[PDB]
């Protein structure tokens, strides 16, 4: 124990963009996030609710137009993607809160 155990440093969030463009691949993956509060925070519960409301989609989902989620509904009706998923990844004192999706090259905008 006694010698040179350190605690974790806090991690700076940038917010920033990384675009690795490869038209040889047949579909686009985007993953967007704002900064999360992380493990401890009471706000996780409430964010997870809001996330749940947006939810997730997949082209194998049963019954499309009538989904509760307005994202997932429009996604399915207008064939705007193949998949999405909301998320809230937690770390100590920080985390990534957003969604990731997958779609055709002419969907990336509308999906966004």
């Amino acid at each position: 124990d006694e010698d040179a155990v350190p605690t974790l440093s806090p991690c700076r969030f940038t917010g920033s963009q990384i675009c690795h463009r490869e038209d040889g691949l047949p579909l686009a993956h985007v993953a967007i996030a704002v900064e999360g509060p992380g493990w401890a925070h009471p706000d996780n519960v409430a964010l997870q609710v809001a996330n749940a409301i947006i939810g997730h989609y997949d082209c194998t989902y049963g019954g499309g137009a009538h989904l509760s989620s307005p994202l997932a509904s429009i996604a399915a009706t207008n064939k705007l993607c193949q998949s999405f998923q909301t998320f809230n990844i937690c770390y100590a004192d920080t985390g990534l809160l957003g969604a990731h999706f997958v779609c055709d090259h002419m969907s990336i905008d509308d999906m966004m």
Partner: protein, 75 residues
């Protein structure tokens, strides 16, 4: 017209970006800026300047000569 998604084909190129609320609008504006404009002028003087000095000398001559022409001295 022509639309994004349908422009051209591009493979293997990573663009790294930054939010403008994360960075300076004016970064090293005089530190790096003044060295560049010098370099750009240096770059272009011998193409841009000589016709205008050519004009300059033909203007100041043609002025000098025109009004000196409307003179006599003997007879």
């Amino acid at each position: 017209g022509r639309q994004f998604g349908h422009l051209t084909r591009v493979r293997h190129v990573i663009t790294y970006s930054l939010s403008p609320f994360e960075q300076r609008a004016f970064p090293h504006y005089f530190s790096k800026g003044i060295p560049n404009v010098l370099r750009r002028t240096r770059a272009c003087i011998l193409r841009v300047a000589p016709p205008f000095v050519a004009f300059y000398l033909v203007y100041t001559w043609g002025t000098q000569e025109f009004e000196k022409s409307k003179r006599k001295n003997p007879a």
